[PDB]
Design a protein around this ligand. Sequence first.
Ligand code: NI
Ligand code: NI
Ligand code: NI
Ligand code: NI
Lengths: 214, 214
Amino acid sequence: DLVDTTEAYLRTIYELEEEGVTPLRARIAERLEQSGPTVSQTVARMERDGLVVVASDRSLQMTPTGRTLATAVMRKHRLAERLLTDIIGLDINKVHDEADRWEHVMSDEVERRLVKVLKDVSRSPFGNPIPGLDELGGTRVIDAATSMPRKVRIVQINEIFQVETDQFTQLLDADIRVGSEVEIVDRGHITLSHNGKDVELLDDLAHTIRIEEL
Amino acid sequence: DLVDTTEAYLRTIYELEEEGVTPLRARIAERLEQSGPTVSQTVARMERDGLVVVASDRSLQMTPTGRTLATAVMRKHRLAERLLTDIIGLDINKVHDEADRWEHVMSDEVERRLVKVLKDVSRSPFGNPIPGLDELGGTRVIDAATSMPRKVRIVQINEIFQVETDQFTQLLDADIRVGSEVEIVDRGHITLSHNGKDVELLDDLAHTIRIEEL
Ligand code: NI
Ligand code: NI
Ligand code: NI
Ligand code: NI
């Protein structure tokens, strides 16, 4: 079945977040092929357990601990996939479904071993970066970003102050303006994501674009 | 936790059977670090589900379906171990505990792939044969044995009829006499096991030693 229920919901919410979708209960229900009311029952208990808040707008907001797990689940999932693909040679059409069971039972140590053995752990076979490899072994953007991805709102871009200007069009093409509710992250390497499009910001631009919490 | 409860109990019972131990509820309880009464509750439901009978003598007797699963669980477990060891390079001290989670979520297809990729699937890293590789892709012994291992009783040995005699001592050393409750199997290659010692019987001896059900 789902193997680990809470972890299913956690990885679901991450993945909605990566696609730029608002992690709504109905969205999660749909993705998991579960019922809405079954979904609220689980969300209730994830709340209790400290993994989630149900925000004003009804969006599931992962607590930092919640987001840490979700990231860990996701990293296991993606590495099981690389493992299944690169090494085992499992039919690509079953790799995901399999990794959907293995994500819940892979130890940290096995993950660490997989980093050693595989050729490249930058992305899953399905083209998505693998997160949390570090964990394993108004307000300026440069200052509002952390290690973990938050949706925030663009409050000003300040193109007047910029020497380097080729990213003006990259933002525009990403419909990043005004704004304009985008996910920001970190590493300095800040990324603005908008639905679900990435603009890797050069430092001058990150230092000058300002955000506000939603 | 146990990941899959029924499958835990099934593989436990197999493994008691392989060591020549009588699969008693208290034995299973002890192995799983569960309580006796928790063990009867599970056994009740495995009965319902058709996987087990509780025999006169209070021994758990796997139904053929039960024994088929148990074999499949065991084969997954052992191949996860080979996989963990040979390929992943997981610390040998954690290989078992890990395979204890992976045994419940490995597909048949993944198993089949593992047969291709690994060098030798004859035994687990812990020295136990891997069973069911075929499934995946009074009464004479030759006639009482099937593909799946039954404990039966030795009713006569008939050493008077034997040309080849070097196995006389092999039986004796295995305390196989009179007898004498032993597991028998198949392939012709019949094996008599006694606690938990194997005598691979040559054909003349298998054709002439007679058994009775317990
Ligand atoms: Ni996947
Ligand atoms: Ni899953
Ligand atoms: Ni083991
Ligand atoms: Ni297990």
